[PDB]
Design a protein around this ligand. Structure first.
Ligand SMILES: Nc1ncnc2c1ncn2[C@@H]1O[C@H](C(=O)NCC2CCNCC2)[C@@H](O)[C@H]1O
Lengths: 197, 233
């Protein structure tokens, strides 16, 4: 069901098997550089989310390495790395070096078929709009890569909800599900609507 | 404006639209050792003959992906870089844009470094608007900075060079030298074209050598053993 969907939850505890399988997973996690420990990040049930598709994983600092560990642990091979060059409204760039960019690892799992590889390039030039916000350009790159398929974002905020996407995160407002398969499986697993332990 | 959309529509890469101390450069130029250089087939050469131990190593193995004798990450990983790095020292490793971003990090850790920066060389195509695993068109290269022991930005932006030109941007030298890391500076797989004051360049294609280990060491003998390369001699 194409329009935006979301679930306010603790991603550590949600049973994500009710959500089905996705062509694209994206995450902008609170790496421990309110955060998740390295073990909690390793233990996220990413493997159930896909059979064949791509993972987009934002990383900074020591998560450049830990994110690679997680990606591999979860069953992905890193096959690309997007960099977002941060600019102001006039397109100028904002410990050893000043940082002008943020990194998004791109992982592949299985053997995806029917994706449109090579339409976009691996450099995003876009405005730092609000602090903690990634650029909205990534949604269009992902949509051209895999049009109309179901996608899931982890640790998203209200601004992140998008058609074709299910968004998970604890700053979202309630639960808004429209896909009948997902609605059914959510009701059976969570008949009282509460998501614990 | 969505420059990703624009690239899809026109072929102009987003980085085409990015727009836009001397006394310090002078001190570096004054402290620089004479350029020193040595032809050596690094596959067959005991790099322990390169003394003394270096404060900075710039490592530029010729990867196959640069062309479209090449070195694989198997070859590179087996270089004994820890045998020539000073206990406190730095490494700058050109990793390309493919599996090197992963294998180059294994190399750094194998040689005893931790990565402290990821310098991206972003290539514009203002003048001319495919790995099978690639998801996106690859328009940049990475130079990983590693540290061992106890003004610039992590981006270099130039136009993509002509085919068959494998040179890296000279700006990487500016970044390295502005760190003031010491004066023993080694460039492995450098070329006649990269030779530079303040650097020892070692590589297979050099046409001439002037390297002498005792002469080289005399540049850093007391009272000069600990200069950062950014102070008066
Ligand atoms: N167990 C959790 N379950 C669900 N949501 C969570 C959880 N733990 C934190 N979150 C939420 O994910 C978002 C977030 O952390 N992005 C990472 C930042 C990195 C630095 N810059 C960009 C943002 C926030 O909305 C957070 O409240």
């Amino acid at each position: 069901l194409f329009p935006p969907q979301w679930i306010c939850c603790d991603i550590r505890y949600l049973d994500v098997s009710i959500l089905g399988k996705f062509a694209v997973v994206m995450a902008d996690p609170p790496w421990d550089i309110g955060t998740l420990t390295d073990d909690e990040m390793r233990r996220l049930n990413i493997p159930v989310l896909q059979d064949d598709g791509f993972l987009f994983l934002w990383v900074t600092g020591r998560a450049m390495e830990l994110g690679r560990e997680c990606l591999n642990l979860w069953g992905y091979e890193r096959v690309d790395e997007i960099i977002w060059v941060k600019t102001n409204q006039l397109q100028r760039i904002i410990h050893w070096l000043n940082h002008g960019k943020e990194h998004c690892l791109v992982g592949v799992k299985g053997n995806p078929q029917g994706f449109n590889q090579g339409l976009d390039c691996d450099v995003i030039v876009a405005e730092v709009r609000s602090t903690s916000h990634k650029p909205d350009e990534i949604y269009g790159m992902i949509e051209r890569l895999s049009p109309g398929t179901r996608k899931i974002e982890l640790f998203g905020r209200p601004h992140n909800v998008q058609p074709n996407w299910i968004t998970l995160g604890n700053q979202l407002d309630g639960i808004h599900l429209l896909d009948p398969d997902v609605v059914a499986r959510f009701k059976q697993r969570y008949p009282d609507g509460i998501i614990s332990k | 404006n969505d420059y990703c959309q624009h690239f899809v529509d026109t072929g102009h890469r987003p980085q085409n639209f990015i727009r836009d101390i001397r006394l310090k450069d002078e001190l570096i130029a004054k402290s620089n050792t004479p350029p020193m250089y040595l032809q050596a087939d690094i596959e067959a050469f005991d790099i322990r003959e390169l003394t003394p131990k270096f404060d900075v190593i710039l490592l530029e193995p010729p990867l196959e992906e640069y062309y479209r004798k090449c070195w694989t990450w198997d070859d590179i990983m087996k270089l004994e870089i820890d045998e020539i790095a000073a206990p406190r020292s730095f490494i700058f490793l050109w990793c390309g844009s493919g599996e090197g971003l992963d294998l180059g990090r294994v190399c750094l850790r194998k040689w005893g470094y931790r990565r402290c920066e990821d310098i991206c060389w972003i290539k514009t195509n203002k003048n001319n608007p495919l790995d099978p695993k690639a998801v996106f068109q690859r328009t940049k290269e990475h130079c990983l900075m590693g540290i061992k022991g106890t003004v610039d930005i992590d981006l270099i932006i130039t136009e993509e060079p002509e085919i068959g030109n494998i040179e890296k941007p000279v700006e990487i030298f500016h970044i390295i030298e502005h760190f003031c890391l010491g004066r023993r500076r080694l460039h492995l797989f450098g070329r006649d074209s990269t030779i530079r004051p303040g650097w020892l360049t070692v590589g297979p294609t050099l046409t001439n050598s002037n390297y002498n280990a005792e002469t080289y060491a005399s540049y850093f003998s007391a009272p000069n053993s600990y200069l950062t390369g950014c102070t008066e001699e």
